[PDB]
Design a binder for this molecule. Structure first.
Ligand SMILES: Nc1ncnc2c1ncn2[C@@H]1O[C@H](COP(=O)(O)O)[C@@H](O)[C@H]1O
Ligand SMILES: Nc1ncnc2c1ncn2[C@@H]1O[C@H](COP(=O)(O)O)[C@@H](O)[C@H]1O
Ligand SMILES: [Cl-]
Ligand SMILES: [Cl-]
Ligand SMILES: [Cl-]
Ligand SMILES: [Cl-]
Ligand SMILES: [Cl-]
Ligand SMILES: [Cl-]
Ligand SMILES: [Cl-]
Ligand SMILES: [Cl-]
Lengths: 438, 438
């Protein structure tokens, strides 16, 4: 049994402690009911978190045996850049892409918080991830990959938990009786999960497809869909060296975390990268989200532009196929499985290491931008090599191309004969050419 | 020999007669040198063509034996809608897609103009497509597929042609000496090819990656990248029935050609769909284009949104994989080959026939838009089916999900063991988890 349905009284239980009402009440309750809760807070560079240092302090106030802030920023940005290099994004609508920011965050917090628990002798995680979402499965897999002895306590399996803390009103009351005046956040018409890479908005009013971005207050950028909001055009240059983003606007960043924070600032002024997606959850049911990822979106445009100037068609085709495959694995919580490693490493090496260069863009509102310049010592784009002005340098002659065309004849005849066979066998209608039957 | 290097004196030669200087001078020359030229003009609903009826009249003035206007509008829109249904677009940059509008146009004009030639006993096409582009190969394949006896005259293989009409100045002079005052179009800093589906801008100043959309005067929409240009927000509803676009803004269109003309008007007011691409040509060298396709872009957003609300993950994955594969075939001139038919029909049937519904959008500038509503009797998106409020209707219980998670354990252990094997064999660095070595 991996999933414990009852409070592990007398045992150490690790809590991924965000400091919200759910984890605050749960930690107090676990302590009051006889377990030994340990709090672990991940520093994920959340755009909406103004004071990570205060969270472990509150955990101790609520009865944590010990409370740690685990810095996950560098790992989050490293995994995000790997996802970018491998195009590991499978959710899109007319090309507008979701950058799998929650999946990446979960890969980083599942592994790193469970590792922190393991170094404290904590082999039980009290994980509140719901029975209907994706995160319960992601955390389950990342946790067991990291600690094979891990057990997971699901408080919603525990009737004692549902009976006392069955809701927000009950939780807040529970805290009050213990002498803590929990100050709830202002109610919103949706639910938000965020990290430095991006933010996701879902549930509540966003469950209705008649609602959309118009009801969202963005937390990583501005409300560009409000015509009253003023957004100044801005030019930005993004430089890559061997696939790693290294400079913005001519300023070099030794720290990729600082680079992403600046990329977020730049994209954020425009609302660059926001999208609305209906996606398929792991359990084969659909959900709807509104997404923000301004910095990754900026880096994605630049990276993709350089890929299109540097790589051949087969290479781009494999990159894109692999990316869609990898995105789905990432979403499923399989980012560290062998089949994911294969796809990720392929891109990190043969695709990304050739990506050295700069792209200059003008950002306006939302996903309206213009490309201004593309530079790279590695471009294979080189119109002068196709120049025919001077035959002394021309790469091929008219006669050469004629030869190339002639080689196509036998297979053309074969295709023509197929069309006649397809008419004879009833698949195509008789005829310029036979037509597909509708 | 398919390609004739010398003027077929005494023989009937079909010209795809656009009425520009190249085809005008070529037709006059062919007549003066002893061939029997026939002119065929395709009505492709070009956004920049104000009078198709005048073109065959000029052909007759220049010496055509006969001149026909072949209406290709309905076929162009039908093939465009098929491409949309099958997502047959392989050129993209950060999701911004080129809709393969030139490839589709060539599939329609290659077949239909060669068929028109064949019904007039014309088995020779005087085709000026250059030795360095994609179109020479597309027309070659579509032509031989349509007429197995076709031969193609390449005037640039004919030194007599290069010597007299070796350039625009020489061509215009040639026309003058024959008593025709050819009125040249105003010079542009790039070359444009267009049809009702889209327009492409390339060459000349657009060969430089430091230039871009900022130098283009769009012909299907407005210059949204000019902050001085005023663009009013607009709401639009797009309805599909069984994958066919049937209504815009509550108005039903029996004629798909009329629907696309209206979709172009709507998208055009915003510049919706414009992109900048570096792509790989058939000959494995890169070229750069600026593209317009406002109506298709509008239909693509709506179609894709409905696909994401209706189809399961495996179905969407196959649709997208197939689409990228098909886009490349389309670009290569293989739209009618068996491997293309397979991909196209799959989507036209099992993907597109379930696409009945409406999508409402707000269009602003360029590719900045918002989704406002998505409706369909065929949605599988249905949050109420996931509702747990009433366990009497809940689709699964917390206990059910726990069972599902438990089934993952054996393969998780296998993955963990792989990571240790990968460390032992030197692929991963020792360790939360072992790391990829850079
Ligand atoms: N910054 C964080 N540090 C530690 N745990 C977190 C953090 N953010 C989220 N979690 C855990 O992940 C769960 C789901 O997060 P959310 O979707 O943001 O509610 C929370 O209930 C926590 O247990
Ligand atoms: N509307 C049209 N009707 C007939 N032939 C055309 C038409 N447009 C283009 N073509 C043919 O295709 C060639 C290449 O077109 P373009 O790329 O627009 O110069 C022209 O030189 C013509 O021979
Ligand atoms: Cl996260
Ligand atoms: Cl959920
Ligand atoms: Cl999935
Ligand atoms: Cl460089
Ligand atoms: Cl065309
Ligand atoms: Cl060319
Ligand atoms: Cl290609
Ligand atoms: Cl419907």
């Amino acid at each position: 049994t991996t999933i414990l349905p009852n409070l592990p009284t007398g045992q150490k239980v690790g809590i991924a402690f965000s400091g919200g009402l759910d984890t605050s009440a749960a930690l107090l309750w676990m302590r009051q009911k006889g377990a030994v809760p340990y709090a672990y807070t991940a520093n994920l560079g959340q755009p909406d978190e103004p004071d990570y240092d205060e969270i472990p302090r509150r955990a101790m106030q609520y009865g944590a045996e010990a409370a740690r802030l685990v810095d996950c920023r560098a790992q989050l940005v490293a995994e995000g850049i790997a996802a970018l290099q491998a195009g590991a994004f499978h959710i899109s609508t007319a090309g507008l892409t979701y950058f799998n920011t929650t999946p990446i965050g979960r890969a980083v917090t599942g592994t790193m918080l469970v590792a922190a628990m393991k170094e404290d002798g904590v082999n039980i995680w009290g994980d509140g991830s719901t029975f209907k979402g994706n995160d319960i499965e992601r955390f389950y897999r990342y946790g067991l990959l990291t600690n094979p002895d891990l057990k997971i306590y699901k408080p919603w399996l525990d009737q004692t938990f549902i009976d006392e803390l069955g809701g927000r009103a009950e939780m807040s009351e529970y805290m009050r009786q213990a002498g803590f005046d929990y100050k709830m956040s202002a109610e919103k018409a949706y639910s938000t999960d965020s990290n430095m890479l991006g933010a996701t908005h879902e549930a509540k009013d966003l469950e209705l497809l008649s609602a959309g971005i118009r009801i969202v207050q963005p937390i990583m950028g501005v409300a560009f869909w409000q015509d009253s909001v003023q957004i100044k055009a801005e030019e930005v240059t993004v430089r890559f060296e061997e696939g790693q983003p290294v400079a913005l606007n001519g300023v070099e960043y030794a720290d990729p975390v600082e680079l992403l924070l600046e990329a977020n600032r730049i994209g954020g002024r425009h609302g660059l990268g926001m999208s609305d997606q209906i996606e398929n959850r792991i359990i084969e049911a659909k959900s709807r989200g509104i997404y923000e990822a301004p910095g990754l979106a900026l880096l994605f445009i630049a990276y993709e532009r350089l890929v299109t100037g540097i790589h051949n068609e087969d290479t781009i085709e494999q990159y894109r196929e692999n990316g869609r495959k990898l995105g789905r694995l990432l979403y499923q919580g399989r980012w560290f499985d062998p089949q994911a490693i294969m796809l990720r490493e392929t891109a990190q090496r043969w695709v990304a290491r050739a990506i050295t260069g700069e792209v200059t863009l003008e950002l306006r509102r939302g996903n309206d931008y213009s490309l201004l310049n593309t530079e790279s010592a590695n471009l294979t784009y080189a119109p002068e090599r196709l120049s025919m002005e001077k035959v002394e340098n021309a790469p091929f002659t008219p006669a050469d191309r004629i030869g190339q065309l002639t080689m196509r004849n036998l297979d053309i005849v074969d295709t023509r004969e197929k069309l006649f066979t397809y008419v004879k066998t009833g698949l195509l209608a008789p005829s310029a050419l036979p037509q597909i039957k509708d």
